[PDB]
Design an enzyme around this catalytic site. Structure first.
Site, PDB file in Angstrom:
ATOM      1  CE1 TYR A  60      -4.461   1.057   0.498  1.00 16.58           C
ATOM      2  CE2 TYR A  60      -3.532   2.552   2.148  1.00 16.58           C
ATOM      3  CZ  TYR A  60      -4.591   2.146   1.367  1.00 16.58           C
ATOM      4  OH  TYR A  60      -5.764   2.864   1.443  1.00 16.58           O
ATOM      5  CB  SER A 133       3.028  -5.077   2.874  1.00 11.03           C
ATOM      6  OG  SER A 133       2.222  -4.842   4.022  1.00 11.03           O
ATOM      7  CG  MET A 134      -2.319  -4.595   1.322  1.00 10.70           C
ATOM      8  SD  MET A 134      -3.222  -3.171   0.722  1.00 10.70           S
ATOM      9  CE  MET A 134      -3.975  -2.597   2.260  1.00 10.70           C
ATOM     10  CD1 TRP A 158      -2.144  -7.283   7.336  1.00 12.84           C
ATOM     11  CD2 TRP A 158      -3.205  -6.765   5.436  1.00 12.84           C
ATOM     12  NE1 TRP A 158      -3.435  -6.953   7.654  1.00 12.84           N
ATOM     13  CE2 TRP A 158      -4.106  -6.624   6.506  1.00 12.84           C
ATOM     14  CE3 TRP A 158      -3.650  -6.481   4.135  1.00 12.84           C
ATOM     15  CZ2 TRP A 158      -5.430  -6.209   6.325  1.00 12.84           C
ATOM     16  CZ3 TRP A 158      -4.981  -6.071   3.954  1.00 12.84           C
ATOM     17  CH2 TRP A 158      -5.845  -5.935   5.046  1.00 12.84           C
ATOM     18  CG  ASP A 179       5.860  -5.808   9.868  1.00 17.56           C
ATOM     19  OD1 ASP A 179       5.195  -4.777  10.060  1.00 17.56           O
ATOM     20  OD2 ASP A 179       6.005  -6.354   8.762  1.00 17.56           O
ATOM     21  CG  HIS A 210       5.942  -3.294   7.042  1.00 22.09           C
ATOM     22  ND1 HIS A 210       5.410  -4.558   6.930  1.00 22.09           N
ATOM     23  CD2 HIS A 210       5.330  -2.540   6.097  1.00 22.09           C
ATOM     24  CE1 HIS A 210       4.510  -4.569   5.961  1.00 22.09           C
ATOM     25  NE2 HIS A 210       4.441  -3.354   5.443  1.00 22.09           N
TER      26      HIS A 210
END
EC number: 3.1.1.101
Length: 269
Positions: A60, A133-134, A158, A179, A210
């Site tokens: 993101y 992540s995303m 994620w 994270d 992260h």
């Protein structure tokens, strides 16, 4: 039989930890991206045969810069790598997965385009997915929805769901110990724990934030060795990499390591 997909010399720890593998790397930006926002394609000029393709998606708000280092690192070991920007920086994981798959589709299309630098360089039957992540969640969605993918190696993943129990694709999860965006114990580890149908690995970077697997990170030796070894083992079926892919790296830089259904060169026992 000679593995038709084996490329490059026999690996060593030093050669996998170096900043570049054996092949010369070039790149180009995609003229007319098809189904995603923008892309850069990294490729080896002299791999000695066709190679598999890997598509990498940021998280993101993030752009190719966050994931770019993978491009040269993987391509120099014998892969065509496309890093992408999404149609919107605020796209969610399912959209990121669609765009990831569209980027792989376009790499295949460019492999068939005589004007393209990657004309005839890609084995379009051998593909893998990575992302942050995303974009890591999107890689796992891509793997769940496209089981012919040969490998997945997301980082700090994620998704709005942690249940990836349908995934049969060999999946390496990079995680970052500290994270606070996608905490390991609520994201990367439950994701890892949910998968019972695949070869899998969990590698958590000690003290990592992260961004611990992003461009400029302080563990490119270990993270790059593990990413390349995983992709070599599972996209190329290259058993020269069974031990590097499946073994505990016994690193001071690691605060958690798990693996399942990963035979590491020890016979049947």
């Amino acid at each position: 039989q000679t593995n038709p997909y084996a490329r490059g010399p026999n690996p060593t720890a030093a050669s996998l930890e170096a900043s570049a593998g054996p092949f010369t790397v070039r790149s180009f930006t995609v003229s007319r991206p098809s189904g995603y926002g923008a892309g850069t394609v990294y490729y080896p000029t002299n791999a000695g045969g066709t190679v598999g393709a890997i598509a990498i998606v940021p998280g993101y708000t993030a752009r190719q810069s966050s994931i770019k280092w993978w491009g040269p690192r993987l391509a120099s070991h014998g892969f065509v790598v496309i890093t992408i920007d999404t149609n919107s920086t605020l796209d969610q994981p399912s959209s990121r997965s669609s765009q990831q798959m569209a980027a792989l589709r376009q790499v295949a299309s460019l492999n068939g385009t005589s004007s393209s630098p990657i004309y005839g360089k890609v084995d379009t039957a051998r593909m893998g997915v990575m992302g942050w992540s995303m974009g890591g969640g999107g890689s796992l969605i891509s793997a769940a929805n496209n089981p012919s993918l040969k490998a997945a190696a997301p980082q700090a993943p994620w998704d709005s769901s942690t249940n990836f129990s349908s995934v049969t694709v060999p999946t390496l999860i990079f995680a970052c110990e500290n994270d606070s965006i996608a905490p390991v114990n609520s994201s990367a580890l439950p994701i890892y724990d949910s998968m019972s149908r695949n070869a899998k690995q969990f590698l958590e970077i000690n003290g990592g934030s992260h961004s611990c697997a992003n461009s400029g990170n302080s563990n490119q030796a270990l993270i790059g060795k593990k990413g390349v070894a995983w992709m070599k083992r599972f996209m190329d079926n290259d058993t020269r990499y069974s031990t590097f892919a499946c073994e505990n790296p016994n690193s001071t830089r690691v605060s958690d390591f798990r693996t399942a259904n990963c035979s590491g060169g020890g016979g049947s026992g």
